[PDB]
């Protein structure tokens, strides 16, 4: 059975070869393709990347304050996540997206509209009706949570492998409170890209073996997904390799 | 060089061996896979699948419809593609989704949001902020114009062939107008399923042998995406196996 990881590593050689020149709003410059898809097992394990030591505290807790609320920066002392309306658009108003995810998995599992989105927040102002950076699909087979993230565009130095270890975080908490075992976190991207500056630090990255995944344990019965503290959450076995700094 | 509709019959055959049963609206029963993907190029060839006849003219002709207008049925003597919002939300109000496409693939290429939905509007009176059927993003590489739809449910016997067809066509058009050429089209879908009755056809069909796909040519220039007629199109060299009667 071939490591997962294997799949972010080839995805990154992939587009070291056979990529594009393009730039982007800083034009800094970025080797770029177009159209991809990773698929990782949540089964008994949890997929934060081996190959380089990622920053687990900050996904963790990052991802927490997305849950619980909030409209206001430094207080996690604009991330590639971007849930500023997941639970708002501020006590009980808007539409809340998450909520709506986790009732729907408990009302209908076998619903194919079980979707929240995510906005990068300078669009907003930009146009009228903004296309969303993220799209989030969960689906439920035989007492099993997946999930598929769609994005616009991946980072794939520094932010996808933080992402894939977020959007892993979410469905393990939101198979939690809704009785259910993590399946599959599927990955795909529009405009997938390395920055240029990035690139040998990532030659250097491809030359690791994954160790094997660490496991995710949650140590207590959490009913409510607001309820969800850092401390109710432990993981076992992350033995990576070195910390390898990517500028941006 | 492997035909590109292999991708879409080793989809078929997973989903039948590796497929779990799953209801769905009609509670007629599926077997679904939850995450695909499938590249198709569009350089000088166009992917109308060839194990079975595609409703070819009936993609053209409901495209166009899409494109101008319009919310009157009958009107090409609720499909599977649901253009209704993607010029409208009737003359020249509301965001025009495909005109914008048009529009920054013009005034900047290298945009990576580049996005125009779809809604089922069965959807649109059921709930508040209705997740939408289809996502389509388009970029810009090289003068290569490319297109992925992101599905969040696909019905593999009947729907996905014709959908291929329908946004390498819109591919072609917009291309054709913003004076690049067709790239790939990558298509990928979260609960990708086949419908029980539809399992004996299919597994018929993956006994034949795919033939070359044909070409699209476009037999004039056109300037605006609205100018565009069914007469406009030739497909050259389609020789595919007899039709398949797949019922619903």
Chains 1, 2 share one sequence.
Not at 36 to 48: G, H, K, N, T, V
Not at 69 to 76: D, F, M, P, W
Not at 230 to 246: L, R, S, W
């Amino acid at each position: 059975p071939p490591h997962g990881e294997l799949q972010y590593l080839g995805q990154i050689q992939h587009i070291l070869r056979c990529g594009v020149r393009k730039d982007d709003r800083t034009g800094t410059g970025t080797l770029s393709v177009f159209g991809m898809q990773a698929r990782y097992s949540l089964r008994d394990e949890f997929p934060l990347l081996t190959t380089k030591r990622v920053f687990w505290k900050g996904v963790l807790e990052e991802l927490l304050w997305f849950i619980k609320g909030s409209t206001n920066a430094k207080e996690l002392s604009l991330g590639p996540v971007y849930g500023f309306q997941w639970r708002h658009f501020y006590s009980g108003q808007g539409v809340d997206q998450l909520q709506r995810v986790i009732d729907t998995i408990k009302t209908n599992p076998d619903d194919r509209r079980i979707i929240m989105c995510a906005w990068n927040p300078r669009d907003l102002p930009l146009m009228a009706l903004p296309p969303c950076h993220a799209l989030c699909q969960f689906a439920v087979v035989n007492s099993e949570l997946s999930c598929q993230l769609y994005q616009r565009s991946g980072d794939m130095g520094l932010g996808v492998p933080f992402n894939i270890a977020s959007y892993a975080l979410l469905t393990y908490m939101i198979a939690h409170i809704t009785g259910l075992k993590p399946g599959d976190f599927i990955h795909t991207l529009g405009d997938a890209h390395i920055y240029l500056n990035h690139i040998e630090p990532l030659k250097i990255q491809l030359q690791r073996e994954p160790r094997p995944f660490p496991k995710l344990r949650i140590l207590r019965k959490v009913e409510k997904i607001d309820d969800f503290k850092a401390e109710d959450f432990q993981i076992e076995g992350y033995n990576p390799h070195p910390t390898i700094k990517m500028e941006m």
